[model samples]
Structure formats: structure tokens, C-alpha cells
Target: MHEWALADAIVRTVLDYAQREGASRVKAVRVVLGELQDVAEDIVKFAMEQLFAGTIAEGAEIEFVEEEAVFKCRNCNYEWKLKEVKDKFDERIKEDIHFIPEVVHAFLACPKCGSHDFEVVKGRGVYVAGIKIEKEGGS
Candidate 1:
């Protein structure tokens, strides 16, 4: 359900971008997916495909990018990967953090200094990297 909501939103943005660019046809799309969010690629793609139908965006090649999670500590300036500490978190916690990503702060910290005061440097949200489109005239 949430994935479908995201799928719907992407269509809206893509069309708006296409219109602004005076696109005659949408050729492709690149969607960045946060690895920590645990989004289903197949489901989101299916939903987007259905939504793309009957529109100029129909049949556009959709690509999804899974970004790895990285955390940086403000205190000690240590950097770590989410995968390194993922085992400490149960499936439930990960699911909860998927929506409210900031929630990860409570569980994760600077692996070196035990400081919760850190930032999720990566693997945070979904966004469009870019879209491939043709102009009104050609090429």
C-alpha cells in the first residue's frame, strides 16, 4: 500500500517534469531507492507500470537504484555502513525505521565512540535521479 502511494507520486512528478521539458515521449526513468527503506522493487515497478499506462510515460524503461546506508559520526568523525550493524536490529525495528528514518538514531551510533549523535549520510529516501525524454521536435 505504501509502495503504491510512492508509485502514484512518481507518476505525478514525472509528468510534471515531462510537461515542463515539452517532452513528446518519456523514454526512461531512474529512481533511487534507499536500501534501508526496504522497498520492493518488483511491486513498485508493477505499480508504476500500471499507473504509466494511458499516458505519454507509458512503456518508459524504469530503473531503480538501491543506495547503501552510510552513517557519519559528528563526535569522532567515524564513518560506517548500515550493513555492519544491521544484525543488531530486528525486522520490526528496520520496518519502523523504513518510514521514520530518523528513528535509526536511537539504535545506531558512532561505532567507534558510542555516540548517538550522528547522521545518516546515505540510504535515506526515494527520488528521481533523472528522466529520459524526447523533445517536441526530435532527438
Candidate 2:
């Protein structure tokens, strides 16, 4: 998946930053995955391991924090957590170049008011959550 490429970039960025900070090695890397990002955690983790080979971040643990999809209805000004309102992936999503979950606002009608116009309030991207490093003179 394309997410693997992005994840590779992220892991490399973390390793570079940690090295710049004088970290000999990284103990762990934490990442937050927004539901609408359409990133499969398994693929990302696999790519992380492969990309970190023979590097300062080798064998570093990876932790992923999942974020729920949130959307705001333009018709009624209703904002809601997608998991509470509907299971976005419960049904098969159309296999189109742009039918990605994050692009739901572009296709599927909003549950609140059957409107396709909406804004992503949260859970549409990925970000570094935290990074654990082995400090000097410490375990």
C-alpha cells in the first residue's frame, strides 16, 4: 500500500531526529493513525521494520494509537464521531481511485442530513505521537 511508503518516510525522519539528538538508539516510536487516513497498521509496521534495518532505530518498538473518524455536517451543523454513528468500513467501499474513506465527504451522503458537504474535524491523517530513546548513561 502507498501507506508503506509514507510510513517509511516517517520512520526515517524519526531515526534521523533521534540521531541528531545524540540518541545512540531508539527504544520505541509511537504513531497516531487517523481512521480516515486509510493506512493499514500492519503494512506500516512491516515497512518500519524493513526500513530501519541496520540503523540506529533497528529493533525499535512501534506503537500505534488509533483515532476515530469525526465529521461535521454542513447542512445541519452536526458534528459526530463516525464510529458511534456508522461503521464506515462495515460495507464494501467502492474500488475507485478516490473512494478512500478520508474522501467520504466527496461521495457518500452524510448520515445526519444526507449531505455530501462536510468538513473533516479530525481523524484524517497521521502524526508522530511520541518517541522513546535510550539516553546516555541510562538503560
Candidate 3:
């Protein structure tokens, strides 16, 4: 699945970082996911559990912070959440819009000024925020 690929990449990166830094093991991994990415958190958690075996991060807790997708209007300086507008569309249409958020301009406008000129302020992709690791020699 798509999540497995992401999970594998995450595990590989974390292990490499921990080992490079002289870490005996990893205690946890913290990541931030953009709402627009449409990642299934549960599947990612499962993938971490399944993929971390035999690695320095085995048994490390996987923590996720889902950042809300926010947009700002250039005309009115108003900010709004993508879900607040996307929720108004039909289910099938919403699915398509997720893959192409720019399409929102075709149907939705800034609620405050009715302007299509806007900028996405947050939640466009995923990133590894930080990781908690146990150093090889420390108290």
C-alpha cells in the first residue's frame, strides 16, 4: 500500500539517523501530516509497527500530529480551513478535489470577500518533525 512505502522510508531514515548519531535505540518518532495529503494514520501506525522489527527503532512509539489545511484570502485577509469549504462538495467531487486542490477556485471562493485569490497557509504535505532517541552513553 501507499502507506507501507512511506512507512518504509520513515523507518529507514530514522534508523540511519539514530545509528549515525550514536544512539543505542529510538524511543519515539514524531511526524506531522498535512490534511491535504489524505494519509491514513492507522495504516501508517500499523506499518511502523510491522516495519520497525529488528531495527534500532523497534518498539518505538509513533506519534502523529495532523495539521489542518488552512487558506488565506488576499483580498479580505481572511483565513479559513479547507475542510470547511471542501465539505460542501459532493463526495465524489471532493475526492477529485483532494488530488487537485487548485480546483477549489472553480467552485469555492473566500467566504469573507468572495474572492478566488487566496494562498494555502498550511497542511500541504508531510514531514518528520523530530525523533526521540536513547544515546549510546547517557543518563
lDDT of 3 by residue, 29-87 (tens): 99888766656889988998888888778899889987777889888899887556434
Residue lDDT tens for model 2, 75-116: 888887654535455554522223357556544457757776
RMSD of 2: 5.8
Top-TM-score candidate index: 1
In model 3, pairs of residues that clash are: none
**Candidate that scores best on lDDT:** 1
Rank by TM-score (best first): 1, 2, 3
Question: On a 0 to 1 TM-score scale, where does candidate 3 land against the true structure?
Answer: 0.68
- Stretches of candidate 3 exceeding 4 Å from the true structure: 73-78, 82-108
lDDT of 1 by residue, 50-80 (tens): 9999999999999998787888888888888
- Evaluated at residue 33, the lDDT of candidate 2 is 78
